[PDB]
């Protein structure tokens, strides 16, 4: 009785560990991707503004 | 009378043109700088997230 309970509880803990490890990696990748998109957005608007500034420097 | 009125109106228009040109350059530079700051912020958080992901890939 002790054995089957202990073994089962070990496997159940292992399963939670694996799920939570996957959740951590998922959340990291999500945050990474959102920041990459923010960089693309800002570099884009920075370039638009750079070009407008250059067109002003003429007239 | 016509001359002094015309001359004065020309100079006044020139003055507005110069003020407005400066305003345009000011607004461009302001937008440029805000986007540069957004890039610095996001690259920073992207790097923090990258490092956390690497620390997960071990454990």
UniProtKB/Swiss-Prot annotation, chains A, B:
Protein with pleiotropic attributes mediated in a cell-compartment- and tissue-specific manner, which include the plasma membrane-associated cell signaling functions, mitochondrial chaperone, and transcriptional co-regulator of transcription factors and sex steroid hormones in the nucleus. In the mitochondria, together with PHB, forms large ring complexes (prohibitin complexes) in the inner mitochondrial membrane (IMM) and functions as a chaperone protein that stabilizes mitochondrial respiratory enzymes and maintains mitochondrial integrity in the IMM, which is required for mitochondrial morphogenesis, neuronal survival, and normal lifespan. The prohibitin complex, with DNAJC19, regulates cardiolipin remodeling and the protein turnover of OMA1 in a cardiolipin-binding manner. Also regulates cytochrome-c oxidase assembly (COX) and mitochondrial respiration. LC3-interaction region (LIR) is required for interaction with MAP1LC3B/LC3-II and for Parkin-mediated mitophagy. This is Prohibitin-2. It is found in: Mitochondrion inner membrane; Cytoplasm; Nucleus; Cell membrane. Residues 4-52 form a coiled coil. The modification N6-acetyllysine is found at residues 14, 50. The chain holds residues 188 to 245 of 299 of the full protein. Expressed in myoblasts. Transmembrane segments: none annotated. Induction: Expression increases approximately 3-fold upon entry into G1 phase compared to other phases of the cell cycle. Also induced following inhibition of mitochondrial protein synthesis by thiamphenicol. It comes from Homo sapiens. Phosphorylated. Tyrosine phosphorylation is indirectly stimulated by IGFBP6. The mitochondrial prohibitin complex consists of two subunits (PHB1 and PHB2), assembled into a membrane-associated ring-shaped supercomplex of approximately 1 mDa. Interacts with ESR1, HDAC1 and HDAC5. Interacts with ZNF703. Interacts with STOML2. Interacts with ARFGEF3. Interacts with SPHK2. Interacts with COX4I1; the interaction associates PHB2 with COX. Interacts with MAP1LC3B (membrane-bound form LC3-II); the interaction is direct and upon mitochondrial depolarization and proteasome-dependent outer membrane rupture. Interacts with IGFBP6 (via C-terminal domain). Interacts with CLPB. Belongs to the prohibitin family.
């Amino acid at each position: 009785g002790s054995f089957s309970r202990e073994y089962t509880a070990a496997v159940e803990a292992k399963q939670v560990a694996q799920q939570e490890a996957q959740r951590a990696q998922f959340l990291v990748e999500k945050a990474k991707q959102e920041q990459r998109q923010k960089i693309v957005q800002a570099e884009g608007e920075a370039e638009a503004a750079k070009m407008l500034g250059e067109a002003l420097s003429k007239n």
